[PDB]
Amino acid sequence: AGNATEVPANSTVLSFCAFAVDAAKAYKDYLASGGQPITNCVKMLCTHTGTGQAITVTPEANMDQESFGGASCCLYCRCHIDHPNPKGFCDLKGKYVQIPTTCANDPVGFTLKNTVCTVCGMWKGYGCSCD
């Protein structure tokens, strides 16, 4: 009974990260060992003529990036573990997340490693232009 959520290609990385003390470090170290990034995310069919900002209420994107469902790009939502926020709530769940097409291979890793400008709302490095 029930409804399956995941695909066997993700069993080892999610199990590894579900038991970690430091889940983010486990996932980085796992990739560094030649492991396959987490797949089975929620990729969005969208027009790709959006603002290009990192975390929005509806899918935004340029042709240079892809829009995902935010929870599907959160290692803590993905492994169903605590979030390192003091209140403990996801930054991404309930929002759409745009990710540079060059990094669309590994959306979960991208959100682990990057950060958003509070001034202009775009990913620092892909690309915020305020100094």
Partner: protein
């Protein structure tokens, strides 16, 4: 194709919104087309829900430099006999707002101890995953009559994992620098370990140079079997599965091939004893 790990065990026909779903498989079909997903402004995202997520189906075959294996060969187990602790878990069944996964009810050990935990699980919400108590029931069969009373008899998991760490520490302090959990058909025992085991690279005890063997969440620190006082998590355990050595029948059937002094009042510890007993007989006879 699919896997049973993290199976959504809710009874809701629908769910989930593209923004709230963890995985493409768990998006509601309304949003799927052309192998992708689509945003439909007129369908609100569900800002109330509680979905039980199954912890059955874990696979510990990671191979990362710096991180040790939980599952070890028989020979590695041979060298650390003194660390052997048989471990079995009787379980209960998700039943009201959910169905289709099992929850730890009574955990037993080679040390005669048995502990029983409140039925609690991992519940997805609009904001996070909520570790919480959940409705449950006993396994249906008449063979499971003795876990009916256990449903009422304890015990919050923060207390259970305190007692587990303390029992193994007081057992293993003068015997080894590790545990080897001796399992039989390990899947559900491995699922229970999610409730009280962390893993990482090897660490050393604060207060020591001995190998770190427990973890504390009060403060992110590590300890040996001697200084693990008040600690709540077992850190980097090791384990073996006796069934993976070739055994046709069930646990008691294959144990009673060698030993006839371990009867079975069907308690979780009784299984864990026969699990350790059968591992000794198999490994060291001839």
């Amino acid at each position: 194709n699919v896997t049973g790990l993290f199976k959504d065990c809710s009874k809701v026909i629908t769910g989930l919104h593209p923004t709230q779903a963890p995985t493409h498989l768990s998006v509601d079909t309304k949003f799927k087309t052309e192998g992708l997903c689509v945003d439909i402004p007129g369908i609100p995202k569900d800002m109330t829900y509680r979905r039980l997520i199954s912890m059955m189906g874990f696979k510990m075959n990671y191979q990362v430099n710096g991180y040790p294996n939980m599952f070890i060969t028989r020979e590695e187990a041979i060298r650390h006999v003194r660390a052997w602790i048989g471990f079995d878990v009787e379980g209960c069944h998700a039943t009201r707002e959910a169905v289709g996964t099992n929850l730890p009810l009574q955990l037993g050990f080679s040390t005669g101890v048995n502990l029983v935990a409140v039925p609690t699980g991992y519940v997805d919400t609009p904001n996070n995953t909520d570790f919480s108590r959940v409705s449950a029931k006993p396994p249906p069969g008449d063979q499971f009559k003795h876990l009916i009373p256990l449903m009422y008899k304890g015990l919050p998991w923060n207390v259970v994992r305190i007692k587990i760490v303390q029992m193994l520490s007081d057992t293993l302090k003068n015997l080894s620098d590790r545990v080897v959990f001796v399992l039989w058909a390990h899947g559900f025992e491995l699922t229970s370990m999610k409730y009280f085991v962390k893993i990482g690279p090897e660490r050393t005890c604060c207060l020591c140079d001995r190998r770190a063997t427990c973890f504390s969440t009060a403060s992110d620190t590590y300890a040996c079997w001697h200084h693990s006082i008040g600690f709540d998590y077992v850190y980097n355990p090791f384990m073996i599965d006796v069934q993976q050595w070739g055994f046709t029948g069930n646990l008691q059937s294959n144990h009673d091939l060698y030993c006839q002094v371990h009867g079975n009042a069907h308690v979780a510890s009784c299984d864990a004893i026969m699990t350790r007993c059968l591992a000794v007989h198999e490994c060291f006879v001839k």
